[PDB]
Design a protein around this ligand. Structure first.
Ligand SMILES: *[C@@H]1O[C@H](CO)[C@@H](O[C@@H]2O[C@H](CO)[C@@H](O[C@@H]3O[C@H](CO[C@H]4O[C@H](CO[C@H]5O[C@H](CO)[C@@H](O)[C@H](O)[C@@H]5O)[C@@H](O)[C@H](O[C@H]5O[C@H](CO)[C@@H](O)[C@H](O)[C@@H]5O)[C@@H]4O)[C@@H](O)[C@H](O[C@H]4O[C@H](CO)[C@@H](O)[C@H](O)[C@@H]4O)[C@@H]3O)[C@H](O)[C@H]2NC(C)=O)[C@H](O)[C@H]1NC(C)=O
Ligand SMILES: *[C@@H]1O[C@H](CO)[C@@H](O[C@@H]2O[C@H](CO)[C@@H](O[C@@H]3O[C@H](CO[C@H]4O[C@H](CO)[C@@H](O)[C@H](O)[C@@H]4O)[C@@H](O)[C@H](O[C@H]4O[C@H](CO)[C@@H](O)[C@H](O)[C@@H]4O[C@H]4O[C@H](CO)[C@@H](O)[C@H](O)[C@@H]4O)[C@@H]3O)[C@H](O)[C@H]2NC(C)=O)[C@H](O)[C@H]1NC(C)=O
Lengths: 226, 50, 49
C-alpha cells in the first residue's frame, strides 16, 4: 500500500519552466530509488532522469542533460523534477516509480521500477489562456428520431482544457455525454455536451450548461430551447 | 506553577529536511525540600524520545 | 554468575508508531559454559523463550 501524489497538472509557454513533485506513502522514499518517464500522447514511453534518495546520485538522458534536474526533500518524503527552458514538443505526462538500485548498487538496471505515480500532465503551447464561448444547440426541428430530442451546448475557442459542464448544477445527469474536445488549427480546444431528454418536454423543462472555466475564471450559463 | 506541576507532555515534528539538534537537561536537587518545592512531587523524571 | 544487569521501566508518552505510544527496550545477556542465568523482575518484563 504505497501511494504516490503528483503535482497538479500544469501548463506553461515554451521557454518557461515547470517542476513536477512526487509524494510517497508507506515505504520511505529514502530507502528507495526513483526515476521519471515521459508519456507523450499515444507516443509510447521514454525514461528521462534517475535519482537515489540517501545517495544523492543522478543520471540523465544525453538528450535533455542540463535542461532537466532531480531534487529530493528527504525531510518531507517527496521528490522533485525540474525542467527549465521547456520546449513545445516536450509536453506530455510524467511519472515517478520506485527503484531498487540503491546503496551499494548505485546502478538502476537491476531494479524493476514499481508503483508508478498517477501522473502529472504538463503542456507547452504558445497559446495563452482564453475564455470559453458558450453557445446553445437545440433541434433544428423536433428530432422525433427513435425517441425524445437532443439539445446541448458548444464551448468554442478556449484554453487550456478542460472546463466542466454541469447541466442545471447537476439536475440533468441523465443522458449527458460530453464529447472529447479537439485542437483547432488555431490552437484552442473545443468540446460539446449533449443530453437525451424526452421530446414531450421540449417546453416543460429548460436546460442550462454551467460551463465553469478555472483557467479563465469564466462562468457562462446558457439556455437551450428550439 | 502555583501549587502543581502537571506531567508536561508536548511534541515537535521535524518538517525541515535537515537534522535537528535539541539540547536539554535534567536538574539534580540538592535537598528534598528543594525538590518538592521547585518540582512539587518529590520524584522527578524526564523522558525525551524520538 | 559473572555480570549483573537491572533496568527500570520509563512510563511516559512518546512518538506514535504503528499505532502505539509505547516502546520495548532490547537487552542481551551472554551466558558462558557452566555459568547460570537468573531473572528477577517485578514486572514490565519481556522474557525470552
Ligand atoms: C560502489 O557503491 C558506492 C555506494 O553506492 C558508490 O559511491 C558513490 O559514488 C558516487 C560517484 O563515484 C558518489 O556520487 C558523487 O557524489 C559527489 C559528492 O556528494 C556525495 O558524496 C558526499 C561526500 O562523499 C563522501 O562521503 C563519505 C564521507 O562524507 C565517504 O564515505 C564517501 O566515500 C565519499 O568520499 C556525501 O556527503 C553526499 O551525501 C550526503 O548528503 C546527503 C544529502 O541528503 C545525505 O542524505 C547523505 O547521507 C550524505 O550525508 C553525496 O552522496 C557529487 O559531487 C558527485 O556529483 C556528480 O555529478 C555532478 C552533476 O550532477 C557533477 O557535477 C560531478 O562532477 C559528479 O560527477 C556524485 O554525485 C557518491 O557520493 C558515492 N556514495 C554514494 C552516495 O553512494 C561507488 O561509486 C560504487 N563504485 C563504483 C565506482 O562503481
Ligand atoms: C503526549 O503528547 C503527544 C504529542 O504527540 C500526544 O499525541 C500522540 O501523537 C500521536 C501521533 O503523533 C497521535 O495519534 C494520532 O491519532 C489519530 C486519531 O486516531 C483516531 O482517529 C482515527 C481516524 O482519524 C481512527 O482510525 C482511530 O481509531 C482513532 O480513533 C490518528 O488519526 C493519527 O494517524 C493518522 O492521522 C494523522 C493525522 O492526520 C496522519 O498524519 C497519519 O498519517 C495517520 O494516517 C493514517 O491513515 C492513513 C489513511 O490514508 C494511512 O495511510 C496511514 O498509514 C495512517 O494509518 C495519529 O495516529 C495521538 O493523538 C497521541 N498518541 C497517544 C499517546 O495517544 C499524546 O496523546 C500525549 N499523551 C497523552 C495520552 O496525554
Amino acid at each position: 500500500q504505497v501511494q504516490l501524489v503528483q503535482s497538479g497538472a500544469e501548463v506553461k509557454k515554451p521557454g518557461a519552466s515547470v517542476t513536477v513533485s512526487c509524494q510517497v506513502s508507506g515505504y520511505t522514499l529514502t530507502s528507495y530509488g526513483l526515476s521519471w518517464v515521459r508519456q507523450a500522447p499515444g507516443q509510447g514511453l521514454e525514461w528521462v532522469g534517475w535519482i537515489n534518495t540517501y545517495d544523492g546520485q543522478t543520471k540523465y538522458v544525453k538528450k535533455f542533460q542540463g535542461r532537466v534536474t532531480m531534487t529530493t526533500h528527504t525531510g518531507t518524503n517527496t521528490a522533485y523534477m525540474e525542467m527549465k527552458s521547456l520546449r513545445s514538443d516536450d509536453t506530455a505526462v510524467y511519472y515517478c516509480a520506485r527503484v531498487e538500485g540503491v546503496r551499494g548498487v548505485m546502478g538502476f538496471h537491476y531494479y524493476p521500477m514499481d508503483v508508478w505515480g498517477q501522473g502529472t500532465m504538463v503542456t507547452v503551447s504558445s497559446a495563452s489562456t482564453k475564455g470559453p464561448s458558450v453557445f446553445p444547440l437545440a433541434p433544428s426541428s423536433k428530432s422525433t428520431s427513435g425517441g425524445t430530442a437532443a439539445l446541448g451546448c458548444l464551448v468554442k475557442d478556449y484554453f487550456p482544457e478542460p472546463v466542466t459542464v454541469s447541466w442545471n448544477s447537476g439536475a440533468l445527469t441523465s443522458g449527458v455525454h460530453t464529447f472529447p474536445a479537439v485542437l483547432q488549427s488555431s490552437g484552442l480546444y473545443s468540446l460539446s455536451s449533449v443530453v437525451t431528454v424526452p421530446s414531450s418536454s421540449l417546453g416543460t423543462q429548460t436546460y442550462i450548461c454551467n460551463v465553469n472555466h478555472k483557467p479563465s475564471n469564466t462562468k457562462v450559463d446558457k439556455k437551450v430551447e428550439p | 506553577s502555583g501549587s502543581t506541576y502537571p506531567v508536561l507532555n508536548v511534541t515537535m515534528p521535524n518538517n525541515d529536511n535537515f537534522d535537528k539538534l535539541y539540547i536539554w537537561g535534567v536538574h539534580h536537587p540538592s535537598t528534598n525540600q528543594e525538590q518538592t518545592s521547585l518540582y512539587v512531587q518529590a520524584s522527578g523524571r524526564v523522558t525525551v524520545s524520538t | 554468575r559473572r555480570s549483573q544487569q537491572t533496568i527500570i521501566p520509563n512510563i511516559g508518552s512518546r512518538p506514535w508508531v504503528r499505532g502505539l505510544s509505547s516502546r520495548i527496550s532490547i537487552y542481551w545477556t551472554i551466558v558462558k559454559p557452566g555459568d547460570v542465568l537468573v531473572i528477577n523482575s517485578n514486572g514490565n518484563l519481556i522474557a525470552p523463550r
